[PDB]
Amino acid sequence: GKQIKLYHYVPLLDDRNVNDQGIDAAGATIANGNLYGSSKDIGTIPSKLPALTENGGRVNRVGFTRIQLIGSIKKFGFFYEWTQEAMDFDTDEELDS
Amino acid sequence: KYNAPNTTPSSIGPQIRLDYYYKKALVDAAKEMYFGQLAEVTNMPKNM
Amino acid sequence: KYNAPNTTPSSIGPQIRLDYYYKKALVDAAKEMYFGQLAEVTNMPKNM
Amino acid sequence: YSDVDAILADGKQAVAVKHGGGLVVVGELGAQVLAAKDVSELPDGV
Amino acid sequence: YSDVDAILADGKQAVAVKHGGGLVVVGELGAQVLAAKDVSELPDGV
């Protein structure tokens, strides 16, 4: 259909992993599906590290995302026309080339 | 996680192919022929 | 005329397929580890 | 609450949720309201 | 509410029941009232 689609699977820790499957140690309403993204700030990762306890259970859930690409094809062209006389009675007998 | 129908986006992300295309198509049988069979043919020559 | 299907339906009729799905997906490469391969290991026994 | 032990240490109880997310937290008051049948069996506060 | 998607799409959550019956649906106040120790932690609503 004159178009081509793709899937670009974003990694987990990339901040492009926008996801609703976000559960922390205690609650499950976390919007940040990825653990901490790539915030890269010492004041953040220890808090967002998946610190599981003695009792396990439904803690630190994560989800993953895919990215769709799109590209389309287009048509182009042009043309020129000449008469026989324009080639015959011309000063230069090489106009064709 | 879930795969809610495309209008409600799937958890993993966008979905491209939502339909399976059955290659074989449906045609209509030609109407059976009646009057054409009963006929006489007379050749009309050219240049006449 | 093929026109611009859906938006401008083609002369023949509906086009159910309008996108070629290239199967090979794009996967981000893994980051290289540096602070690993640098530590020793001391075993911690169980029951302790 | 940060860790699962916080709910236990606090004294609240914790129920795992299946279909959607998980780990709803129950307190003694919330349970007692939750354990009510008619307007008589809710606590004094509500 | 017709299907388990209806609760999930609405944002309401549902817990599987053990002793007898189907599912118990939880809203966010209903969860937050549920997680109350004393009179202080109930909503402004209650």
Chains C and E touch (3+ CB pairs under 8 A): no
| Method used to obtain the model | cryo-EM
Distance, in Å, from the CA atom of D38 to the CA atom of D36, rounded to the nearest integer, reads 6
Provide the chain A residues 29-88 that lie in CB contact (below 8 A) with chain C: 69
Report the residue of D1, D4, D12, D13 to disrupt the A interface, i.e. the one with the largest count of A CBs within 10 Å: D4
- E31 at D interface, C-beta within 8 A: yes
Resolution (A): 3.3
- CA nearest B12: which of B23, B4, B1, B22? B1
Of A5, A21, A65, nearest to B13 by CB-CB distance is A65
For C25, which of A1, A7, A11 is closest by C-beta distance? A7
| C-alpha neighbours within 13 Å on the C-beta side of residue C24 | 0
* Mutation target among A48, A53, A62 for the D interface, most CBs of D within 10 A: A53
Q: Shortest Cα distance from A37 to chain D (angstroms)?
A: 19
B45 CB-near residues (< 8 Å, 6+ apart) = none
Q: Are E13 and E26 in contact (CB under 8 A)?
A: yes
User: What phi and psi values does residue E31 have, to the nearest 5 degrees?
Assistant: -75, -40
**Alpha-carbon dihedral angle through residues D35, A56, A32, A30, given to the nearest 10 degrees:** 10
Strands A3-9 and C20-21 come out as parallel
Q: In Å, how far from its chain's centre is CA C27? A: 5
Q: What is the rounded CA–CA span in Å between residue C2 and residue C10?
A: 4
